[PDB]
Short mmCIF file of C-alpha atoms and ligand atoms in Angstrom, two decimals:
data_model
loop_
_atom_site.label_atom_id
_atom_site.label_comp_id
_atom_site.label_asym_id
_atom_site.label_seq_id
_atom_site.Cartn_x
_atom_site.Cartn_y
_atom_site.Cartn_z
CA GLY A 5 -7.42 24.98 -62.54
CA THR A 6 -9.99 25.60 -59.77
CA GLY A 7 -11.06 23.72 -56.60
CA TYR A 8 -7.86 24.50 -54.73
CA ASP A 9 -10.25 24.86 -51.77
CA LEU A 10 -11.68 21.32 -51.69
CA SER A 11 -8.70 19.39 -50.28
CA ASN A 12 -6.85 20.32 -47.15
CA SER A 13 -3.10 20.12 -47.76
CA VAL A 14 -3.31 21.99 -51.12
CA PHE A 15 -1.67 25.28 -52.05
CA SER A 16 -3.69 27.63 -54.26
CA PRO A 17 -1.69 29.55 -56.86
CA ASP A 18 -1.52 32.62 -54.63
CA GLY A 19 0.22 30.49 -51.97
CA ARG A 20 -2.65 29.75 -49.63
CA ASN A 21 -4.50 26.94 -48.07
CA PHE A 22 -8.09 27.68 -48.47
CA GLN A 23 -9.38 24.99 -46.08
CA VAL A 24 -7.50 26.66 -43.22
CA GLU A 25 -9.06 29.90 -44.31
CA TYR A 26 -12.46 28.40 -44.20
CA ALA A 27 -11.75 27.05 -40.74
CA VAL A 28 -11.12 30.62 -39.69
CA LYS A 29 -14.71 31.36 -40.71
CA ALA A 30 -15.97 28.75 -38.31
CA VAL A 31 -13.98 30.65 -35.69
CA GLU A 32 -15.05 34.18 -36.66
CA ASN A 33 -18.49 32.70 -36.31
CA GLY A 34 -18.05 31.52 -32.70
CA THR A 35 -18.62 33.41 -29.46
CA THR A 36 -16.25 35.92 -28.01
CA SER A 37 -13.37 35.04 -25.77
CA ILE A 38 -10.32 36.92 -24.52
CA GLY A 39 -7.07 37.02 -22.64
CA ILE A 40 -5.41 39.74 -20.63
CA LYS A 41 -1.95 39.57 -19.24
CA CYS A 42 -1.61 41.34 -15.93
CA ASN A 43 1.87 41.86 -14.43
CA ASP A 44 2.11 38.63 -12.44
CA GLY A 45 -0.60 36.50 -14.04
CA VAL A 46 -3.29 36.22 -16.72
CA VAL A 47 -7.04 36.40 -17.01
CA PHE A 48 -9.38 34.59 -19.33
CA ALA A 49 -13.01 35.43 -20.05
CA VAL A 50 -15.69 34.20 -22.41
CA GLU A 51 -19.26 34.94 -23.50
CA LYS A 52 -21.58 31.95 -23.09
CA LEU A 53 -24.72 32.52 -25.13
CA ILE A 54 -27.99 31.55 -23.45
CA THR A 55 -29.99 29.60 -26.05
CA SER A 56 -32.88 29.01 -23.78
CA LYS A 57 -33.98 29.55 -20.19
CA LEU A 58 -33.73 25.79 -19.82
CA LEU A 59 -29.94 25.95 -19.58
CA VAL A 60 -28.69 25.40 -16.07
CA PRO A 61 -26.91 28.54 -15.11
CA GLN A 62 -23.32 28.20 -13.95
CA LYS A 63 -23.01 24.79 -15.52
CA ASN A 64 -21.66 24.53 -19.05
CA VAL A 65 -18.20 25.43 -18.35
CA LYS A 66 -16.16 26.58 -21.34
CA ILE A 67 -12.77 27.45 -19.88
CA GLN A 68 -10.56 24.42 -19.40
CA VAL A 69 -7.45 23.97 -17.27
CA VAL A 70 -4.27 22.17 -18.30
CA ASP A 71 -1.87 20.67 -15.77
CA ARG A 72 -2.42 22.90 -12.77
CA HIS A 73 -1.13 26.22 -14.02
CA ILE A 74 -2.45 26.76 -17.52
CA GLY A 75 -5.82 28.06 -18.65
CA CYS A 76 -7.21 27.67 -22.16
CA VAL A 77 -10.26 29.24 -23.67
CA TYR A 78 -11.42 29.06 -27.24
CA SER A 79 -13.86 30.44 -29.83
CA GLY A 80 -15.30 28.33 -32.65
CA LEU A 81 -16.12 24.61 -32.90
CA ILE A 82 -16.24 23.65 -29.21
CA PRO A 83 -15.64 19.97 -29.64
CA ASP A 84 -12.43 20.75 -31.64
CA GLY A 85 -11.33 22.95 -28.73
CA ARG A 86 -11.83 20.14 -26.24
CA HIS A 87 -9.96 17.71 -28.48
CA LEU A 88 -7.10 20.15 -28.56
CA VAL A 89 -6.97 20.43 -24.77
CA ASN A 90 -7.01 16.69 -24.36
CA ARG A 91 -3.94 16.74 -26.49
CA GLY A 92 -2.41 19.55 -24.53
CA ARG A 93 -2.95 17.60 -21.34
CA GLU A 94 -1.14 14.51 -22.68
CA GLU A 95 1.56 16.75 -23.94
CA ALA A 96 2.01 18.45 -20.51
CA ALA A 97 1.93 15.10 -18.62
CA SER A 98 4.57 13.60 -20.86
CA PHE A 99 6.77 16.69 -20.46
CA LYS A 100 6.40 16.67 -16.73
CA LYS A 101 6.88 12.99 -16.35
CA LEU A 102 10.23 13.24 -18.04
CA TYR A 103 11.48 16.64 -16.99
CA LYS A 104 9.78 16.87 -13.56
CA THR A 105 9.10 20.53 -13.86
CA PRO A 106 5.57 21.57 -14.92
CA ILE A 107 5.58 22.60 -18.54
CA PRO A 108 6.78 26.15 -19.29
CA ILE A 109 4.16 28.16 -21.15
CA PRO A 110 6.15 28.82 -24.35
CA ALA A 111 7.11 25.15 -24.47
CA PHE A 112 3.44 24.30 -24.16
CA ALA A 113 2.47 26.78 -26.86
CA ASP A 114 4.75 25.17 -29.37
CA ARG A 115 3.25 21.81 -28.48
CA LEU A 116 -0.16 22.97 -29.54
CA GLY A 117 1.37 24.80 -32.42
CA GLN A 118 3.01 21.78 -33.93
CA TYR A 119 -0.03 19.58 -33.44
CA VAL A 120 -2.28 22.15 -35.07
CA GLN A 121 0.15 22.77 -37.94
CA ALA A 122 0.17 19.04 -38.33
CA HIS A 123 -3.52 19.13 -39.36
CA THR A 124 -2.70 21.36 -42.34
CA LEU A 125 -0.18 18.90 -43.79
CA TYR A 126 -2.43 16.13 -45.10
CA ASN A 127 -5.66 15.89 -46.99
CA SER A 128 -6.95 13.10 -44.80
CA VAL A 129 -7.57 15.36 -41.86
CA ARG A 130 -9.37 18.60 -41.35
CA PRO A 131 -7.83 21.74 -39.78
CA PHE A 132 -8.89 22.85 -36.37
CA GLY A 133 -12.02 24.98 -36.21
CA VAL A 134 -10.88 27.17 -33.27
CA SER A 135 -8.66 29.97 -32.09
CA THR A 136 -7.37 29.26 -28.65
CA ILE A 137 -6.24 31.72 -26.11
CA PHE A 138 -4.20 30.34 -23.29
CA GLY A 139 -1.40 30.88 -20.84
CA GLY A 140 -0.33 30.86 -17.23
CA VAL A 141 2.57 31.34 -14.85
CA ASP A 142 5.90 29.65 -15.31
CA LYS A 143 9.24 30.37 -13.60
CA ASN A 144 9.86 33.30 -15.97
CA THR B 34 10.71 -4.68 -10.04
CA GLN B 35 12.20 -8.14 -9.61
CA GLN B 36 14.10 -7.50 -6.41
CA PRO B 37 13.80 -4.55 -4.01
CA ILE B 38 16.82 -2.37 -3.32
CA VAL B 39 16.18 0.69 -1.15
CA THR B 40 13.45 -0.19 1.29
CA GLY B 41 11.08 1.22 3.83
CA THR B 42 9.89 -0.77 6.81
CA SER B 43 6.69 -1.02 8.74
CA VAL B 44 3.72 1.28 8.26
CA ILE B 45 1.23 1.11 11.13
CA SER B 46 -2.30 2.34 11.64
CA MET B 47 -5.56 2.15 13.49
CA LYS B 48 -8.90 3.71 13.50
CA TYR B 49 -10.51 5.44 16.49
CA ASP B 50 -13.88 7.05 17.17
CA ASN B 51 -13.73 9.90 14.57
CA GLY B 52 -10.92 9.12 12.24
CA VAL B 53 -7.78 7.19 11.67
CA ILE B 54 -4.14 7.48 12.56
CA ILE B 55 -1.22 6.26 10.59
CA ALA B 56 2.53 6.33 11.02
CA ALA B 57 5.89 5.36 9.51
CA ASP B 58 9.58 5.94 10.14
CA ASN B 59 11.72 8.15 7.99
CA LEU B 60 14.25 5.63 6.79
CA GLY B 61 15.30 4.15 3.48
CA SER B 62 17.65 1.22 4.05
CA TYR B 63 19.89 -0.44 1.53
CA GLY B 64 20.13 -3.96 2.82
CA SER B 65 21.60 -3.41 6.29
CA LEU B 66 23.11 -0.02 5.45
CA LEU B 67 20.80 2.61 6.95
CA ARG B 68 21.36 4.92 4.03
CA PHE B 69 18.73 7.53 3.71
CA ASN B 70 17.33 9.25 6.69
CA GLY B 71 15.10 11.94 5.38
CA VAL B 72 12.47 9.83 3.73
CA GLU B 73 8.80 10.60 3.92
CA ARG B 74 6.66 7.52 3.46
CA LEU B 75 3.41 9.18 4.39
CA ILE B 76 1.75 10.59 1.32
CA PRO B 77 -1.23 12.80 1.87
CA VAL B 78 -3.74 13.04 -0.97
CA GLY B 79 -6.15 15.91 -0.61
CA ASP B 80 -7.23 16.68 2.93
CA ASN B 81 -8.93 13.38 3.71
CA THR B 82 -6.44 10.68 2.76
CA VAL B 83 -2.98 9.59 3.65
CA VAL B 84 -1.29 6.75 1.86
CA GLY B 85 1.52 5.05 3.72
CA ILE B 86 4.05 2.91 1.90
CA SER B 87 6.69 0.24 2.68
CA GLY B 88 8.96 -1.83 0.51
CA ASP B 89 10.91 -0.61 -2.50
CA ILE B 90 11.38 3.17 -2.44
CA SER B 91 11.88 3.63 -6.17
CA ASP B 92 8.44 2.14 -6.58
CA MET B 93 7.06 4.21 -3.78
CA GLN B 94 8.28 7.29 -5.65
CA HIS B 95 6.57 6.07 -8.76
CA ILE B 96 3.34 5.64 -6.81
CA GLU B 97 3.69 9.20 -5.39
CA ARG B 98 3.78 10.49 -8.95
CA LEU B 99 0.68 8.55 -9.91
CA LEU B 100 -1.08 10.08 -6.97
CA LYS B 101 -0.13 13.61 -7.86
CA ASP B 102 -1.48 12.94 -11.31
CA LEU B 103 -4.68 11.45 -10.18
CA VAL B 104 -5.32 14.65 -8.23
CA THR B 105 -4.44 16.73 -11.30
CA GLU B 106 -6.73 14.69 -13.60
CA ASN B 107 -9.68 14.63 -11.23
CA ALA B 108 -9.58 18.45 -11.37
CA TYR B 109 -10.00 18.46 -15.17
CA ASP B 110 -13.46 19.60 -16.33
CA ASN B 111 -14.55 19.23 -12.76
CA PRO B 112 -16.05 22.30 -11.21
CA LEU B 113 -16.49 20.25 -7.99
CA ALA B 114 -12.91 19.06 -7.56
CA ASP B 115 -12.69 20.89 -4.25
CA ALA B 116 -16.16 19.70 -3.11
CA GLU B 117 -18.57 16.84 -3.91
CA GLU B 118 -16.30 15.35 -6.59
CA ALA B 119 -12.92 15.46 -4.85
CA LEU B 120 -11.14 12.17 -4.38
CA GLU B 121 -12.30 9.83 -1.61
CA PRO B 122 -9.98 7.32 0.07
CA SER B 123 -12.11 4.47 -1.29
CA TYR B 124 -11.33 5.62 -4.84
CA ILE B 125 -7.61 6.08 -4.37
CA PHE B 126 -7.48 2.66 -2.85
CA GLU B 127 -9.40 0.91 -5.58
CA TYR B 128 -7.10 2.52 -8.05
CA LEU B 129 -3.97 1.40 -6.30
CA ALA B 130 -5.30 -2.11 -5.71
CA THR B 131 -6.09 -2.27 -9.39
CA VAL B 132 -2.64 -1.27 -10.36
CA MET B 133 -0.97 -3.63 -7.98
CA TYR B 134 -2.99 -6.65 -9.11
CA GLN B 135 -2.35 -5.77 -12.67
CA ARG B 136 1.43 -5.42 -12.17
CA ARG B 137 1.53 -8.65 -10.32
CA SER B 138 -0.37 -10.26 -13.12
CA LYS B 139 2.33 -9.21 -15.61
CA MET B 140 4.96 -10.69 -13.35
CA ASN B 141 6.40 -7.32 -12.74
CA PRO B 142 5.27 -6.15 -9.38
CA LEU B 143 5.45 -2.89 -7.52
CA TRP B 144 7.37 -4.16 -4.57
CA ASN B 145 5.33 -2.53 -1.85
CA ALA B 146 2.80 -2.87 0.82
CA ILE B 147 0.51 0.04 1.14
CA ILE B 148 -2.03 1.28 3.63
CA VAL B 149 -4.63 3.84 2.67
CA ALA B 150 -6.12 5.67 5.60
CA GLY B 151 -8.83 8.25 5.44
CA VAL B 152 -12.22 9.64 6.19
CA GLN B 153 -14.99 9.35 3.64
CA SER B 154 -17.11 12.41 2.80
CA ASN B 155 -20.04 10.69 4.63
CA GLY B 156 -17.98 10.73 7.90
CA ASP B 157 -16.85 7.03 7.74
CA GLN B 158 -13.43 5.78 8.59
CA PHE B 159 -11.51 4.12 5.80
CA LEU B 160 -8.60 1.73 6.35
CA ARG B 161 -7.53 -0.83 3.80
CA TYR B 162 -4.34 -2.59 2.83
CA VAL B 163 -3.00 -3.77 -0.48
CA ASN B 164 0.37 -5.18 -1.44
CA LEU B 165 2.56 -6.42 -4.29
CA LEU B 166 0.39 -9.46 -4.95
CA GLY B 167 -2.75 -7.37 -5.11
CA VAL B 168 -4.02 -8.79 -1.82
CA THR B 169 -6.40 -6.59 0.16
CA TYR B 170 -8.07 -6.49 3.52
CA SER B 171 -9.48 -4.30 6.21
CA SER B 172 -9.30 -4.33 9.96
CA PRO B 173 -9.61 -1.89 12.85
CA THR B 174 -5.81 -2.16 12.91
CA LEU B 175 -3.38 -2.70 10.07
CA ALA B 176 0.40 -2.79 9.73
CA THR B 177 3.03 -3.94 7.28
CA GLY B 178 6.30 -5.77 7.77
CA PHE B 179 7.36 -6.07 11.38
CA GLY B 180 4.41 -4.05 12.47
CA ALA B 181 2.12 -6.90 11.57
CA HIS B 182 4.00 -8.94 14.12
CA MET B 183 4.55 -6.46 16.96
CA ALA B 184 2.29 -3.49 16.38
CA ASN B 185 -0.93 -5.25 15.68
CA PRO B 186 -0.80 -7.14 18.95
CA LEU B 187 -0.65 -3.89 20.92
CA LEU B 188 -3.13 -1.95 18.88
CA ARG B 189 -5.57 -4.81 19.11
CA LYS B 190 -5.45 -4.53 22.88
CA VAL B 191 -7.13 -1.14 22.32
CA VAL B 192 -9.52 -2.05 19.45
CA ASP B 193 -10.04 -5.78 19.60
CA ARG B 194 -13.36 -5.39 17.75
CA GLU B 195 -15.61 -3.16 15.72
CA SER B 196 -17.64 -2.21 18.75
CA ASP B 197 -14.51 -0.68 20.40
CA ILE B 198 -13.87 1.93 17.69
CA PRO B 199 -16.52 4.38 19.02
CA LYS B 200 -14.97 4.02 22.51
CA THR B 201 -11.48 4.85 21.45
CA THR B 202 -10.43 8.48 21.59
CA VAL B 203 -7.79 10.18 19.55
CA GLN B 204 -5.57 10.70 22.66
CA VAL B 205 -5.68 6.97 23.39
CA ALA B 206 -5.23 5.87 19.81
CA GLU B 207 -2.29 8.25 19.33
CA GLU B 208 -0.49 7.20 22.50
CA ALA B 209 -0.93 3.55 21.40
CA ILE B 210 0.61 4.22 18.05
CA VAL B 211 3.53 6.13 19.50
CA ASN B 212 4.22 3.28 21.85
CA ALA B 213 4.22 0.84 18.99
CA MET B 214 6.79 2.90 17.15
CA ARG B 215 8.98 2.69 20.23
CA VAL B 216 8.58 -1.03 20.34
CA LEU B 217 9.52 -1.39 16.74
CA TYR B 218 12.52 0.86 17.34
CA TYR B 219 13.66 -1.47 20.02
CA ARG B 220 13.27 -4.60 17.88
CA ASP B 221 13.30 -3.99 14.12
CA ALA B 222 16.88 -3.78 13.00
CA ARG B 223 15.69 -1.90 9.86
CA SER B 224 14.07 0.99 11.76
CA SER B 225 14.67 4.54 12.73
CA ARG B 226 14.13 6.72 15.74
CA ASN B 227 12.56 9.49 13.63
CA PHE B 228 9.17 9.16 12.20
CA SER B 229 6.09 10.82 10.78
CA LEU B 230 2.53 10.41 11.98
CA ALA B 231 -0.74 11.59 10.53
CA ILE B 232 -4.28 11.95 11.83
CA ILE B 233 -7.42 12.15 9.74
CA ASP B 234 -10.33 13.30 11.86
CA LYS B 235 -13.75 13.92 10.55
CA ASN B 236 -13.87 17.23 12.48
CA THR B 237 -10.29 18.53 12.74
CA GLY B 238 -9.43 17.17 9.24
CA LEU B 239 -5.89 16.21 8.38
CA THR B 240 -3.18 16.82 10.95
CA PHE B 241 0.22 15.76 9.63
CA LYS B 242 3.14 15.55 12.09
CA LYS B 243 6.67 15.44 10.85
CA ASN B 244 9.83 14.91 12.73
CA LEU B 245 8.77 12.95 15.74
CA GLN B 246 11.31 10.95 17.76
CA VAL B 247 10.83 7.93 19.93
CA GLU B 248 11.15 9.21 23.53
CA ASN B 249 10.93 7.54 27.06
CA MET B 250 13.09 4.63 26.31
CA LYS B 251 14.30 2.18 28.88
CA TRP B 252 17.86 1.03 28.75
CA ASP B 253 19.20 1.45 32.30
CA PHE B 254 18.71 -2.22 33.14
CA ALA B 255 21.33 -2.97 30.50
CA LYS B 256 24.04 -1.97 33.00
CA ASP B 257 23.44 -5.13 35.06
CA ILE B 258 23.71 -7.53 32.12
CA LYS B 259 27.11 -9.17 32.33
CA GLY B 260 28.25 -11.96 30.08
CA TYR B 261 26.00 -14.56 28.57
CA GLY B 262 25.92 -17.23 31.23
CA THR B 263 28.37 -17.49 34.09
CA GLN B 264 30.55 -14.37 33.99
CA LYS B 265 29.79 -12.09 37.04
CA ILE B 266 31.86 -8.91 36.23
MG1 MG C 1 7.21 -5.94 0.82
MG1 MG C 2 -9.77 10.17 -13.61
MG1 MG C 3 -5.23 1.21 -14.68
MG1 MG C 4 14.96 0.64 33.08
#
C-alpha cells in the first residue's frame, strides 16, 4: 500500500504517523521562539517578523499568559497556538475551581499533552501545527 | 440557594466629594449564634472598586471567586489590563447584576444584597446596589439590611441630595459612617463590634482599613434604669 500519509490516525508500516510529521513541518517553518529556565523563574522570548512598515509596533502580541503564573509561547500556525491556550485556560480554571490551588506546572503540561495527543487519535481532526514552550512558578 | 444559613448583616456606604466610602462588620451569624468572627465582607477588585456583600456567606464566597476570575480573564490577551482596559466598577456591577437576575430567573437565587462602590477612570463616583431579585438602584447613600433602616437616615442628613456631594469631605463622610456602625451595633442583634471600612478616592486611591472597633459608646445611663414600671431599687 501507499497513502499512509493522507489520513491522520493512521500508522505507516514503519510505525509512524505521517500527518503529525507533516505538522512538524508547519512548525519548523514558523518563527523562532525560546524558553530559558533561570534558578527561580523562567523567561520566554520570540521573534516577530515585520512584514511591512504598516504594522503597529508593540502591538501584535504573541506571548500569552495562562492563569496568572504561566507563560506560553509558540512557533508555527498561530491560530492553532491560540486555540491551544484557550484550552489551557479552561483546563487551569477547572483545576483551580476544584482544587483551589493554582495549577502546578507539570499538571498543566500533561493537560496540554493529553489534549494534543488526542488530536492524533482520530482521522476526523487534524494535529496541532505548533510547538509550544511554556512554564512558570509553582510551589516546587 | 433556597434558604440562607450563615449570614452577614448590613453593608453601608456613601459618596463624598472625591470618592466613596463603604463599610461592613466582620461577622457571620448562624441564626442567632454569632459563629464566625473573622469574616471579611469587603471585597476589593483592582484598586478602584470595593464590593460589599450581605446575606448568605457561602454565596458571598462564590461571588468572591467569580470576581477573582473576572480579574484573571480581563488580563488575558490584554496588554492594557493595568491601564486603559482594567476593570471599572460599572463593569463589575453590570456583571453581578446580570448574574443575580439570571439566578433569580431560574428560581435559584444568590441570597445576597450587594453594594459596588468605586471610582470610574474618568474621576466619577460609582455607587450601585443589586440584590437576590436582580433589583438595582443608585443613591448618594446606600445600605442593606438594617442599615437601610438606621444608617440611611443618618447618612442622608449629610448628603440629602446630589448637590451636597461636592460639599462633603472625606473626614465628614468617614465620621458619619463610623457613627452609623456604632448605631447599628447598639441596635442590630446580628451585628459585631469589629468591622472593616474602605475608601476609594480619586486622588489617594484605595485605602482599606481592617480591624476597626466601635468606640465612644454610651452606656452609663443604664445604671439608673431600675425595673420596668414601678420598682425603685
Ligand atoms: Mg438578603
Ligand atoms: Mg471577560
Ligand atoms: Mg453570565
Ligand atoms: Mg451616658
